[PDB]
Amino acid sequence: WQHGEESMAKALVACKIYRSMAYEAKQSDLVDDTSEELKQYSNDFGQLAVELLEQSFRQDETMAMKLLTYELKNWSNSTCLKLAVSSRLRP
Amino acid sequence: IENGVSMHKFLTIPRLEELYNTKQGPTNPMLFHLIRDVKQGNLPPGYKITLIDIGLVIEYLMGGTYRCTYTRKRFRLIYNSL
Amino acid sequence: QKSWIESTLTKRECVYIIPSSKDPHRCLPGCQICQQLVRCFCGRLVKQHACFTASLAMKYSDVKLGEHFNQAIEEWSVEKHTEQSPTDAYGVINFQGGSHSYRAKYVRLSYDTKPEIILQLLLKEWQMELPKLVISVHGGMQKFELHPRIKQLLGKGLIKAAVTTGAWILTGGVNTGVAKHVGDALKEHASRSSRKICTIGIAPWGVIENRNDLVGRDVVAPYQTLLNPLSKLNVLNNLHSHFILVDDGTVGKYGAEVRLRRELEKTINQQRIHARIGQGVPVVALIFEGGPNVILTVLEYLQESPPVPVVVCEGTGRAADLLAYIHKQTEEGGNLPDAAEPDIISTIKKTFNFGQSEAVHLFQTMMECMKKKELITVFHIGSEDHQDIDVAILTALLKGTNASAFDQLILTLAWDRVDIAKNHVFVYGQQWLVGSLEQAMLDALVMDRVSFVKLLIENGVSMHKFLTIPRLEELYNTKQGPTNPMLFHLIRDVKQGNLPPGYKITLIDIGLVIEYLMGGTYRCTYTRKRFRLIYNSLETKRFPYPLNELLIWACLMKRQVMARFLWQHGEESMAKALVACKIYRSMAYEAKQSDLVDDTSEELKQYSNDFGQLAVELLEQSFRQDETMAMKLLTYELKNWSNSTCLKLAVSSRLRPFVAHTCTQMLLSDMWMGRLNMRKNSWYKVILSILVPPAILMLEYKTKAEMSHIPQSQDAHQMTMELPITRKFYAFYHAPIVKFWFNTLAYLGFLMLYTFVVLVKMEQLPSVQEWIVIAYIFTYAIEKVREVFMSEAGKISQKIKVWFSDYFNVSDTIAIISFFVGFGLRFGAKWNYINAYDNHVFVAGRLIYCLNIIFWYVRLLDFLAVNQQAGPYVMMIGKMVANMFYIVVIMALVLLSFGVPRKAILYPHEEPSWSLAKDIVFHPYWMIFGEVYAYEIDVCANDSTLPTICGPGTWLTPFLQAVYLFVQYIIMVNLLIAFFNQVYLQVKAISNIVWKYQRYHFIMAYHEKPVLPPPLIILSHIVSLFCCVCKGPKLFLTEEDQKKLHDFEEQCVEMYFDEKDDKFNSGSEERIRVTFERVEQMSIQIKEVGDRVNYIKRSLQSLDS
Amino acid sequence: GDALKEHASRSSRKICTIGIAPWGVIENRNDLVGRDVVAPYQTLLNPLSKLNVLNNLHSHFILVDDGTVGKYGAEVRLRRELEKTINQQRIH
């Protein structure tokens, strides 16, 4: 994650994937859920985005609002904010 | 990657494709479950995971309308060509 | 063309052909394998030279048929056999595979290009600022090898000198040379990713690896990290930012460093270091192990004009060692000690593997190198010889290059670094020019370099001497610093719209701003008739107290770090900090209102509450020494700040924590007393002594000694200048506590009569009581008018804006205006003479009385809040009524959610009526208070008070009401409880502070109130009126006491700093920091001994044997 | 003074240094003329300055005027007597 680019975007995709695997694990069980293992893995990425944002909001609040809205084009023409709302990432 | 190994150079279809098809690591045994779901029950003997498949999982995990690059008409072509 | 790069720059390349070494190797017929292999002297394979005109000659073999004077070719003229064209290789490297992918950028030009073009695109196209240093590292370029300390430490400097001066390190580019080595430092340090060093590293396009990857116009490059073991072509080094790839027009060849790396150096040294300063940008040449060519290159910079110095290093390799070696042998430069003049040539041999004719040639270069040992230095990492190559680099430009200490200093000023000048310019026995110190302070102030202000004011630069009208006047008229762009806004406002073209700010103007920012009546020195004269005339042109004038400048132009520095110096420290808190607090309000871009208001509001907190923290440091003098500090007329007071400024800035300190409250008590010593006396005695005048003569007053810290009016000072019986009354009646308990007992005799009138019937004419009632209000109203006109504020529109920002002065206005609607309709009426309450006019005027009364019982909270326990609880009922408006609206939806269905379900025949506006709101409100109307639920029941309301649907209301009260008595009314219980400390803490602050405006209103209460006050009005047509406090000190107080402030400031410095140095967190940093250093200085001791042992094991 | 500043005595009623000297070898004598008068005495580190500044950190001074510029001697006539005269007084 730290390598490459589009760091905020990637972290919020991960928070969705882990959050989405956890829900499927609970539902479709076979042995130990590993769900709280995943829910911890989501809320780790999903907390980097929050902590990456504040580090950008404190520099230039204007551009840090453009980050939440530019079409990503490597992530299905979605948006760094429409992914958070998809993951119910309230913070 | 420090001493110099560009991921851009070391990331083909065949390389990437088998990185899913390995048990030689801390594998998630759940990935094979999500796949056999999106196939609607189908489950061949060995089942080489194809990148069509990983796409349809992400389209299913990310929900809504998230289309991965792995499912678009372009990528479907080239995957059936190599 | 759309690209200034190729629109301006061009690429050179071979266009003719010149076979390089015609003779084919093997493969018996030459013709094909000859041409296929035999490169042009152009460069690359002869066949590769496409450039069509050449390619219609490559067709057979070349240009100039075969032999055809094979000797004639053999030059490849780089203008005729070589034409240039617009660039097609200029883009941005990405360094494919780089661990966070450090970036750079490239162009590709022709070496005949002039440096004007390279400079302008560098600072326009590539968009940089001119540096403040150019570290051109003309060292040895052979991927060489070092020891960790010098691999590690040497970078600790080199990086640091370049980040602290925004340098442009100018290497050779290639990753097999001096470039390779700085990168080892650039990464070991990482510069905490930023706009760090903006390294250039110019190299050619000829010896470069993967040239074809980064071809194309303004194109990203997949440039790859090829550490292929052989790779005759070389990679650019990683960490280097911006590149230039000057294409000579030939692969393989060299030379595209010096044609520009010469010109660039001189051309940057031709430009001005800064707007204010007028020197040339410095060039410094660093050497990592050099070479036969470098050791001459070293010499060239020694021989240039300007004499660009050099820095070499003991222990990087051959050249840097030898130049450092002969620096030991050669003394004075001119010597060469002749005992070893080829003995170095013995060393010149072994290090390089040179010969003989070049051995003296190297030795020759060594001589002219030494002929000026002045402007060249050495880095002896093995010893304590000017550590941390920084100092050496930064210093070396000053020692060698002949320049006055001014010309030295002003450079150090540009480089925001005192530590150099503190130890290398401000050194012993120096020739300091008379006005250079002054002229430097002009530059350090405008450029916001506090550290040099400190330096100069230490070494001796009196602000009293360096502060004229013209100097000060332009310090506002500068853009060369962190300017506030708002100052020009406040000026164009106070000019009432006027805005000339350039508008030299005059000191008239700054005055009118401060008069506008500080408000009230604050007259600055800049506007008084005296100063207006002298300004229109130009040591009398100086200011007495400069640091009172710069502290304004540092704050108007938003230069906080300057402001605090200029605050600790000078005198009147408490006063200055509270002016600043007002100015910043006043600019913030004007920023919000008059916006243009980012408010900067929270930036200012933080700047105010910083000063405004020093005053509070400076006070407590003075209250804990001598509580008496610390109350005199709050009251002495300042005389440099418009005859104002250290407390009247806090009140102006609404700085609650100061007025609510325990010194601003013990003074206010001491004025509340007056000439009374109410710690001995008791409130019983005052109430008695009012209704018993001759009991005043048994009250124990205070001596003129015990009223030194208490500001007085002129008259009370006189009664203590000129206790007798007659002065023993005057001191009672003119006491604030007495004026209070002499109004309360009147007001509490007003509310006992008014209450009597309101309750008892009211005949045609007012009874004796009601006349006395009107008398109070009328005479009270007059007291409220004169309270306005004789208020502190200036323009009436501002007097009519502070007196209406008060809950009880509005409530008086509503209650004095209303009672005279009441007295108007009560006295002015026809009075039916049969029964009152048959004239609705009369009725009306009463119900005005019986309701106005609520304004007058509620006012006893103005009296009851005098107490230190009751005040807060009165100042909470505002902050609980305010912060629950939103629960209480939620409690009114539920009320109508229930009241509308019930009145619809129960009374289903109602024509439109106003009763449908009460009965949907009436009973559902009295339910909140526990009235369930239990015999009206289930109206069809047998126990009902409403047996006629029984009808279809009326079985639903018991359910609706069940749901209702569960919300209005269990959910919502217990949400209030939980609201108050959790907002109690944080409103009780405040409401104390809002109370202790409002105690000021209350006491200081009785201290200007008439003695005589609002029934008899009319006498004291007529006295003042009659005589003012015919005929505030001050802390009167003697000139001796002004000094003793002045001494008190001085010491108390000095302690505030001396204590906090120790509270920081004594803290654990700080001792861990030092301990840590020592123990790091200790590890080093031990292990080196541990090494050395291990050499003194292996020695003595073998010396004697 | 180099010591008095390196330590700073954590500003207080610290050492009350006297440092008696004359009015003859003194620099900017004219700045501090007048009865009970504040002095704009200035920090002149002019490189030559045959006349010399009083050192900074020194508190109370005495400037015994022999009645002659340039001359010396207005140390010992009092710096003798003072020493003995304080040594004549009771310590407590």
Ligand SMILES: CCCCCCCC/C=C/CCCCCCCC(=O)O[C@@H](COC(=O)CCCCCCCCCCCCCCC)COP(=O)([O-])OCC[N+](C)(C)C
């Ligand atoms: C510090 C600032 C805040 C305080 C503000 C202070 C100013 C206060 C502001 C006041 C403004 C409020 C309005 C004025 C009051 C009267 C209005 C009214 O209705 O009058 C009535 C009486 O009119 C008469 O002329 C007969 C009674 C004498 C008038 C006494 C009221 C004026 C006193 C003012 C002393 C104020 C000065 C106090 C000393 C400074 C008119 O109606 P009517 O005639 O009854 O109707 C007859 C109808 N019928 C025939 C059918 C029956």
Ligand SMILES: CCCCCCCC/C=C/CCCCCCCC(=O)O[C@@H](COC(=O)CCCCCCCCCCCCCCC)COP(=O)([O-])OCC[N+](C)(C)C
């Ligand atoms: C017989 C009886 C008949 C009457 C019975 C009915 C009585 C009805 C009961 C009425 C309630 C009366 C008490 C409320 C007082 C206001 C509270 C207050 O001061 O708030 C704020 C004033 O804020 C301001 O900006 C100042 C100007 C506002 C004036 C408000 C007028 C209300 C008039 C209502 C007309 C009602 C008239 C109804 C009758 C015609 C507090 O201060 P601030 O916000 O800091 O001030 C700005 C200062 N600053 C800019 C420096 C920050």
Ligand SMILES: CCCCCCCC/C=C/CCCCCCCC(=O)O[C@@H](COC(=O)CCCCCCCCCCCCCCC)COP(=O)([O-])OCC[N+](C)(C)C
């Ligand atoms: C259906 C019934 C519904 C309820 C009816 C209404 C009842 C409720 C009352 C309504 C009166 C209207 C005024 C509301 C107050 C507004 C201001 C405020 O909230 O606080 C502000 C001041 O507050 C004050 O100065 C007064 C606070 C209100 C006291 C209420 C009277 C209590 C006694 C009545 C006895 C009557 C008994 C007899 C009755 C016949 C302070 O707010 P803040 O957060 O500090 O803001 C900063 C202020 N600043 C700008 C100055 C810096």
Ligand SMILES: CCCCCCCC/C=C/CCCCCCCC(=O)O[C@@H](COC(=O)CCCCCCCCCCCCCCC)COP(=O)([O-])OCC[N+](C)(C)C
């Ligand atoms: C800023 C903050 C806002 C404050 C709150 C909002 C303001 C308050 C708003 C209130 C609504 C308005 C009510 C009055 C409407 C007119 C009534 C009328 O003309 O006649 C009525 C008479 O009875 C009365 O006039 C009594 C007074 C009204 C009751 C007030 C209830 C207050 C408690 C609740 C307050 C909580 C409010 C909850 C929120 C909704 C009835 O009709 P009638 O036929 O004439 O009477 C029978 C006579 N007969 C038998 C002889 C025939």
Ligand SMILES: CCCCCCCC/C=C/CCCCCCCC(=O)O[C@@H](COC(=O)CCCCCCCCCCCCCCC)COP(=O)([O-])OCC[N+](C)(C)C
């Ligand atoms: C919980 C433990 C306690 C026991 C539980 C036992 C449960 C068994 C309940 C059974 C209810 C059915 C039997 C009653 C009908 C008989 C006819 C009758 O009397 O009609 C009456 C209507 O009265 C009603 O309709 C009564 C209310 C019915 C709904 C009950 C609540 C739903 C269950 C709970 C869920 C609630 C949701 C909660 C939401 C948060 C009409 O007669 P009247 O009143 O005389 O008016 C007519 C007069 N007139 C003709 C002159 C105009």
Ligand SMILES: CCCCCCCC/C=C\CCCCCCCC(=O)O[C@@H](COC(=O)CCCCCCCCCCCCCCC)COP(=O)([O-])OCC[N+](C)(C)C
């Ligand atoms: C504006 C401020 C002024 C300053 C105030 C002082 C100046 C005011 C001074 C005097 C005013 C009165 C003088 C005029 C004549 C009075 C006649 C009268 O009412 O007699 C009644 C007493 O009095 C009352 O019942 C009303 C007055 C006294 C009680 C209320 C005010 C007391 C507070 C103020 C003083 C203490 C303060 C305490 C708190 C600190 C008695 O008669 P009655 O009740 O009708 O019954 C008799 C029996 N019979 C009917 C069967 C025959």
Ligand SMILES: CCCCCCCC/C=C\CCCCCCCC(=O)O[C@@H](COC(=O)CCCCCCCCCCCCCCC)COP(=O)([O-])OCC[N+](C)(C)C
């Ligand atoms: C009247 C104008 C109304 C316009 C608004 C003015 C607002 C108030 C202005 C000014 C301030 C108050 C003074 C004027 C009002 C009170 C006096 C008064 O009017 O007495 C009336 C006489 O009534 C009596 O003789 C018996 C009761 C009152 C006398 C005691 C006065 C109390 C105030 C003293 C202590 C406070 C002062 C202390 C300073 C030393 C005369 O008025 P009238 O209407 O002719 O009376 C009816 C007819 N009658 C005479 C046959 C009985």
Ligand SMILES: CCCCCCCC/C=C\CCCCCCCC(=O)O[C@@H](COC(=O)CCCCCCCCCCCCCCC)COP(=O)([O-])OCC[N+](C)(C)C
């Ligand atoms: C400066 C501000 C001024 C305020 C406004 C001034 C208002 C001045 C207004 C009027 C002055 C003149 C009075 C007469 C009016 C015409 C009606 C009339 O004559 O008689 C009618 C009275 O009908 C009513 O309604 C009387 C009461 C209305 C006044 C309400 C004022 C509210 C003030 C709010 C508080 C403000 C607080 C301000 C706070 C900041 C009927 O009576 P009649 O015919 O005479 O005889 C008996 C009838 N009968 C036979 C049927 C039994």
Ligand SMILES: CCCCCCCC/C=C\CCCCCCCC(=O)O[C@@H](COC(=O)CCCCCCCCCCCCCCC)COP(=O)([O-])OCC[N+](C)(C)C
């Ligand atoms: C005429 C014959 C004589 C008798 C008449 C007079 C009787 C007495 C009058 C009033 C009753 C209360 C008296 C207590 C005063 C004690 C002294 C005191 O400390 O006062 C304090 C409050 O000062 C005040 O004035 C508080 C408000 C009282 C006057 C307004 C009426 C409110 C009470 C009625 C409301 C309606 C309730 C209805 C209930 C039925 C001030 O001082 P402190 O807080 O101690 O200051 C602390 C710091 N220090 C001490 C270092 C300075």
Ligand SMILES: N#Cc1ccc(COC[C@H]2O[C@@H](n3c(NCc4ccc(Cl)c(Cl)c4)nc4c(N)ncnc43)[C@H](O)[C@@H]2O)cc1
């Ligand atoms: N000593 C002393 C002293 C004497 C009297 C007072 C009473 O307060 C007077 C002023 O106190 C002001 N004030 C008040 N007054 C409180 C209040 C006033 C009236 C009522 Cl009925 C109630 Cl329920 C409460 N609250 C304030 C606040 N939250 N912020 C700023 N100012 C406030 C108000 O303008 C009022 O005019 C306060 C202190």
Ligand SMILES: C[C@@H]1CC[C@@]2(OC1)O[C@H]1C[C@H]3[C@@H]4CC=C5C[C@@H](OCCC(CO)CO)CC[C@]5(C)[C@H]4CC[C@]3(C)[C@H]1[C@@H]2C
């Ligand atoms: C958001 C909130 C939604 C609910 C609500 O507030 C806002 O919406 C308001 C609309 C109001 C009605 C509008 C008009 C009239 C006509 C009038 O006709 C007099 C006729 C005759 C008398 O005899 C003249 O002589 C009688 C009163 C009535 C019905 C109002 C009652 C209160 C109502 C229902 C209010 C209610 C509290």
Ligand SMILES: CC(C)CCC[C@@H](C)[C@H]1CC[C@H]2[C@@H]3CC=C4C[C@@H](O)CC[C@]4(C)[C@H]3CC[C@]12C
């Ligand atoms: C709607 C009209 C016609 C009828 C009367 C309305 C009621 C609600 C009015 C009449 C008198 C008013 C009071 C008069 C004075 C005050 C003192 C003030 O400090 C707080 C509000 C308070 C306590 C008012 C609250 C509202 C009030 C009680």
